[PDB]
Ligand binder design. Structure first.
Ligand SMILES: CN(CC[C@H](N)CC(=O)N[C@H]1C=C[C@H](n2ccc(N)nc2=O)O[C@@H]1C(=O)O)C(=N)N
Ligand SMILES: [Mg+2]
Ligand SMILES: [Mg+2]
Ligand SMILES: [Mg+2]
Ligand SMILES: [Mg+2]
Ligand SMILES: [Mg+2]
Ligand SMILES: [Mg+2]
Ligand SMILES: [Mg+2]
Ligand SMILES: [Mg+2]
Ligand SMILES: [Mg+2]
Ligand SMILES: [Mg+2]
Ligand SMILES: [Mg+2]
Ligand SMILES: [Mg+2]
Ligand SMILES: [Mg+2]
Ligand SMILES: [Mg+2]
Ligand SMILES: [Mg+2]
Ligand SMILES: [Mg+2]
Ligand SMILES: [Mg+2]
Ligand SMILES: [Mg+2]
Ligand SMILES: [Mg+2]
Ligand SMILES: [Mg+2]
Ligand SMILES: [Mg+2]
Ligand SMILES: [Mg+2]
Ligand SMILES: [Mg+2]
Ligand SMILES: [Mg+2]
Ligand SMILES: [Mg+2]
Ligand SMILES: [Mg+2]
Ligand SMILES: [Mg+2]
Ligand SMILES: [Mg+2]
Ligand SMILES: [Mg+2]
Ligand SMILES: [Mg+2]
Ligand SMILES: [Mg+2]
Ligand SMILES: [Mg+2]
Ligand SMILES: [Mg+2]
Ligand SMILES: [Mg+2]
Ligand SMILES: [Mg+2]
Ligand SMILES: [Mg+2]
Ligand SMILES: [Mg+2]
Ligand SMILES: [Mg+2]
Ligand SMILES: [Mg+2]
Ligand SMILES: [Mg+2]
Ligand SMILES: [Mg+2]
Ligand SMILES: [Mg+2]
Ligand SMILES: [Mg+2]
Ligand SMILES: [Mg+2]
Ligand SMILES: [Mg+2]
Ligand SMILES: [Mg+2]
Ligand SMILES: [Mg+2]
Ligand SMILES: [Mg+2]
Ligand SMILES: [Mg+2]
Ligand SMILES: [Mg+2]
Ligand SMILES: [Mg+2]
Ligand SMILES: [Mg+2]
Ligand SMILES: [Mg+2]
Ligand SMILES: [Mg+2]
Ligand SMILES: [Mg+2]
Ligand SMILES: [Mg+2]
Ligand SMILES: [Mg+2]
Ligand SMILES: [Mg+2]
Ligand SMILES: [Mg+2]
Ligand SMILES: [Mg+2]
Ligand SMILES: [Mg+2]
Ligand SMILES: [Mg+2]
Ligand SMILES: [Mg+2]
Ligand SMILES: [Zn+2]
Lengths: 181, 117, 69
RNA sequence: CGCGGGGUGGAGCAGCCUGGUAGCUCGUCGGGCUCAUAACCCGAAGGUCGUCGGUUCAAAUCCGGCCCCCGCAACCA
RNA sequence: CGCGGGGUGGAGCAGCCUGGUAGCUCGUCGGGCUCAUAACCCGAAGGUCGUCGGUUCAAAUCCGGCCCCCGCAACCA
RNA sequence: UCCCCCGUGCCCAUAGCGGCGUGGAACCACCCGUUCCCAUUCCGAACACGGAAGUGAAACGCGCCAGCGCCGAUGGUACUGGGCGGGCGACCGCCUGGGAGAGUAGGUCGGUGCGGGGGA
RNA sequence: GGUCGCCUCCUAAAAGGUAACGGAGGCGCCCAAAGGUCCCCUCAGGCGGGACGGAAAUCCGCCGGAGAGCGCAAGGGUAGAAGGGGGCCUGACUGCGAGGCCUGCAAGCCGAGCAGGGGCGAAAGCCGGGCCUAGUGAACCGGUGGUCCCGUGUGGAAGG
RNA sequence: AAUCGCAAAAAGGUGGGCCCAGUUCGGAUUGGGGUCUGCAACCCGACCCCAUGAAGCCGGAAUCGCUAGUAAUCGCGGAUCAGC
């Protein structure tokens, strides 16, 4: 709905340096970010933690959306889990909550991670787009020591029109992402 | 979460709360009271909201800490392996590398007394 | 939008860095930092920190070449 | 082969019925007392449970094939 | 199904015909003693007194009975 | 009546998998937005709605190839209803009628009926 | 010794049916949601992808027609749902039943449609329990609740 | 060498600071960086600086010394010896 600092960043700076490399013969063939699916993917909320909520409202006040409880695919023995047990926290940041979130990761949250050292670049899938994992949560700007209780890393997935892995590299690299080498 | 790798203790002194970082002691804490002139020892929260920030900077780029210093002390010993030295072979074993006495004690190198028949 | 349950994030000033209030509408009214997108090893600069070229290893200890060929 | 019961730390026994649940005794290794050994006092160590499939979310436990311990039979008029 | 009684600390039970105390040995910790495993001994954590709804001035001893174990009885086309 | 298009029926993959192309004035789609109706175990993704700036990239459409899948004969045979003889047997032979499965040659990148909206 | 009723499959010779102390398995339950409807949705698996996190917890990607699932045995069927989720619900109706399936009898089984009165749906329509095929017991004797039909001259009652 | 030297005796007195926490208790362990001896410091020393900041919240069964300036608790000192 809105207009923000990375949304225009992707606008007049990124679209050209992309037609730079691959020289797209059409307005749309050019990459662009669609979905952003954050995944705390608990399982720490087994047959116990009803307090999975005070860890997922934190997920709300850092993503802006309520996260939807993903349950069990089936029942699992050594994992201590029954088909139906809550074990996931999926929030799909789509459209203009994506840019509002993605910039706040890159400019403020990404650097505040302890001993930052690039981004693992092989972790690109190939057939399409990209995603890679965390370690914590309070590194995110919205919180600190007393507000955050238990520690909880989280997964984060990009879904772009990057048909090819190479052109994905460029899209994110230019968009503000620091890589390992 | 605070400074500079992880959050130093609020409600704690601005001479004491120093050593807690992976890289500082009461020895190096004198940079505070003497190389930026900081409070005698009045608390971390107690500090002036701009004096708080002036301390953030002057010890990050002045020394080495946390993840680098952990690795600095760590990656250094990998060298000792790749040559095959008496200090890098006894670390390769996890035994008192700094050469002492390994009959009685030598526990901290060894873990709990394993005990055997 | 589902009406209610989502935190009403109004445009909030992210007062970070050394001269950048990285504005974008966060649900947290104001923010701070001590390590940011500004000052950073991989964000710009060589970043020697205070770690030079591997402490001193090994011929940088000087007091060498006692022998004169 | 016919039925019946059994197989679990080294020895001997619980545990199965009602699945997720491994205990009792001895002994064994470590330590104490003692001149010393036992006694006794202080600690710990030790079984994927016959064997295989398999049911279930998952098997000492439920199920079936085979190996084995033991108990009655295989009536020969 | 119908008559008999309670379902009390973790494991047993006296409180109880006549309500007043949020009950005693075993078990368990610490303690004096023991050479010890022991009896003795001083202090202790344990009741939502099966629950629910009552009778009052509160109930665990008085009720409607939920409950579902022990007990007896009789019937089973 | 010929053609393209949209909405659709029908034969049952010769239709399909894939790669190669081309189609936007039309019509279809993506696309614009969240105000309204409506809407998400989160998200206007989807369903919804108000639109018409962009486009034919995606999807879909018409087409091209035969790598895949698919369909696939003729000939002969196995088998067999019926009628005979043959071997100790396990089984074998002849007559008459019927006659496959595989495999071979080859075919296939669809074929159409109803209405509507364009072209002449 | 084993067996005895029921269901699945095979034997069973391409209709139905068919024996043997033939070969293999299950049933004597379950579900106020696992049911009715309306809306909506789509598997197993494999490869790459990713903090804890795994051969397999959850999130992302491309390939998948059905090998998943459908309470539990097996066969048939089945995603153009019969399977997964949500809203309202209670047709897991009362009175019937044209016509058949099976069949020695008796039982078993399918059901359009009509009437009352409701459920969901905008409506067309769908609901007389569950993807079907097991989850069972004739008659006698009695219990309980109703109805108020008989009630030993007669009004009741007893009994039925 | 009752000259001068090792020599500030430490517990103590006095001011301050902590604030019931594996902590300012605790100093094990370790990485690089230095001084001193002695040819010499890998095995192998001792001191020094940075940093690291471990077991330990008082000890199972058992067990030891000591009856008065003694137990307990403090520092100093020689001999061995280049150093330790
Ligand atoms: C030992 N007896 C004999 C009973 C008879 N009247 C006589 C006799 O010999 N009967 C026997 C006849 C054969 C019978 N038998 C044996 C084997 C077999 N396979 N089938 C049989 O019938 O078993 C009988 C048996 O011994 O009791 C008695 N105590 N009565
Ligand atoms: Mg190009
Ligand atoms: Mg790193
Ligand atoms: Mg050097
Ligand atoms: Mg047996
Ligand atoms: Mg044995
Ligand atoms: Mg026993
Ligand atoms: Mg068994
Ligand atoms: Mg067990
Ligand atoms: Mg004792
Ligand atoms: Mg067995
Ligand atoms: Mg015999
Ligand atoms: Mg009694
Ligand atoms: Mg009274
Ligand atoms: Mg003694
Ligand atoms: Mg009797
Ligand atoms: Mg009875
Ligand atoms: Mg159509
Ligand atoms: Mg094209
Ligand atoms: Mg145009
Ligand atoms: Mg193209
Ligand atoms: Mg296509
Ligand atoms: Mg055409
Ligand atoms: Mg045509
Ligand atoms: Mg044509
Ligand atoms: Mg054509
Ligand atoms: Mg050709
Ligand atoms: Mg061809
Ligand atoms: Mg060809
Ligand atoms: Mg063929
Ligand atoms: Mg014949
Ligand atoms: Mg013949
Ligand atoms: Mg023929
Ligand atoms: Mg013939
Ligand atoms: Mg025309
Ligand atoms: Mg015209
Ligand atoms: Mg018999
Ligand atoms: Mg017939
Ligand atoms: Mg028969
Ligand atoms: Mg594979
Ligand atoms: Mg993987
Ligand atoms: Mg990973
Ligand atoms: Mg990994
Ligand atoms: Mg995985
Ligand atoms: Mg099944
Ligand atoms: Mg079959
Ligand atoms: Mg089949
Ligand atoms: Mg449904
Ligand atoms: Mg459901
Ligand atoms: Mg409605
Ligand atoms: Mg009839
Ligand atoms: Mg009839
Ligand atoms: Mg009907
Ligand atoms: Mg109707
Ligand atoms: Mg059924
Ligand atoms: Mg009666
Ligand atoms: Mg009458
Ligand atoms: Mg009268
Ligand atoms: Mg009557
Ligand atoms: Mg003081
Ligand atoms: Mg204390
Ligand atoms: Mg501890
Ligand atoms: Mg003891
Ligand atoms: Mg003592
Ligand atoms: Zn900045």
């Amino acid at each position: 709905p809105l207009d923000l600092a990375l949304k225009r960043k992707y606008y007049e700076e990124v679209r050209p340096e992309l037609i730079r490399r691959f020289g797209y013969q059409n307005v749309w063939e050019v990459p662009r970010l669609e979905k952003v699916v954050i995944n705390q993917g608990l399982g720490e909320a087994k047959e116990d933690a009803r307090i999975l909520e005070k860890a997922a409202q934190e997920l709300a006040l850092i993503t802006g959306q309520k996260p939807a409880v993903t349950r069990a695919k089936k029942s699992i023995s050594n994992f201590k889990l029954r088909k139906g047990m809550p074990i996931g926290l999926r929030v799909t940041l789509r459209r203009d909550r994506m840019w509002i979130f993605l910039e706040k990761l890159l400019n403020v949250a990404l650097p505040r991670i302890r001993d930052f050292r690039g981004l693992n670049p092989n972790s690109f899938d190939g057939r399409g787009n990209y995603n890679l994992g965390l370690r914590e949560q309070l590194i995110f700007p919205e919180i600190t020591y007393d507000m955050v209780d238990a520690l909880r890393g989280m997964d984060i997935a990009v879904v772009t029109t990057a048909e090819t892995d190479e052109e994905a590299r460029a899209l994110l690299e230019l968009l503000g992402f620091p890589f390992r080498k | 979460a605070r400074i500079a790798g992880v959050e130093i203790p609020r409600n704690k002194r601005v001479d004491v709360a120093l050593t807690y970082i992976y890289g500082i002691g009461k020895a190096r804490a004198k940079e505070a009271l003497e190389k930026t002139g900081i409070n005698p020892a009045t608390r971390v929260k107690d500090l002036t909201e701009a004096e708080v920030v002036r301390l953030r900077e002057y010890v990050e780029n002045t020394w080495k800490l946390e993840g680098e210093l952990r690795a600095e002390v760590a990656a250094n010993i990998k060298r000792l392996m790749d040559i095959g030295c008496y200090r890098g072979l006894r670390h390769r074993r996890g035994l008192p590398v700094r050469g002492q006495r390994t009959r009685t004690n030598a526990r901290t190198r060894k873990g709990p007394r394993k005990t055997v028949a | 939008m589902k009406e209610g349950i989502h935190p009403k994030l109004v445009p909030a000033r992210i007062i970070c860095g050394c001269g950048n209030v990285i504005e974008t509408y966060s649900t947290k009214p104001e923010i701070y930092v001590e390590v940011c997108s500004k000052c950073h090893p991989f964000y710009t600069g060589q970043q020697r920190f205070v770690d030079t070229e591997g402490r001193v290893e090994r011929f940088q200890r000087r007091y060498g070449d006692s022998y004169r060929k």
